[PDB]
Amino acid sequence: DNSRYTHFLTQHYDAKPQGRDDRYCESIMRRRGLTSPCKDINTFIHGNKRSIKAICENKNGNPHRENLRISKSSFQVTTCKLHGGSPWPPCQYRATAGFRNVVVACENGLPVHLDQSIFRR
Numbered sequence: 001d002n003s004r005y006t007h008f009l010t011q012h013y014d015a016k017p018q019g020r021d022d023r024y025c026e027s028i029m030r031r032r033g034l035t036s037p038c039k040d041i042n043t044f045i046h047g048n049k050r051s052i053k054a055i056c057e058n059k060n061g062n063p064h065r066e067n068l069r070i071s072k073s074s075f076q077v078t079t080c081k082l083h084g085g086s087p088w089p090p091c092q093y094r095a096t097a098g099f100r101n102v103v104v105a106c107e108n109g110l111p112v113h114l115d116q117s118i119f120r121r
């Protein structure tokens with residue numbers, strides 16, 4: 001059952017996004033099913049999937065707080081933050097592009113949770 005890994009990728013992985021502007025956030029949040037209700041904040045990791053998986057090994061991760069792992073490498077990310085407002089569509093988002101390491105939870109060698117708290121700021 002790698003369904004939590006597949007859901008992680010749906011909520012938090014976009015290999016090569018192109019523009020990482022407000023329109024990108026509004027479109028991908030709809031595409032990935034995150035607008036019923038409107039998720040308040042959601043981050044997408046970009047780049048190679050093998051790098052994200054490697055976070056669950058000593059190859060690209062350290063243990064972090066109680067039960068998480070933090071990556072040794074930096075990743076291109078885009079944080080989508082709801083503007084307002086309403087919990088139901090239409091959902092308007094502000095994009096913030098960044099480049100830093102990420103905090104995940106691992107199960108059976110695979111990422112299954114992204115810790116959003118480092119992208120609140």
Ligand SMILES: [Pt+2]
Nearest residue numbers: 007010011033
């Ligand atoms: Pt979900």
Ligand SMILES: [Pt+2]
Nearest residue numbers: 082083084094
């Ligand atoms: Pt706003």
Ligand SMILES: [Pt+2]
Nearest residue numbers: 082083084085
């Ligand atoms: Pt406003």
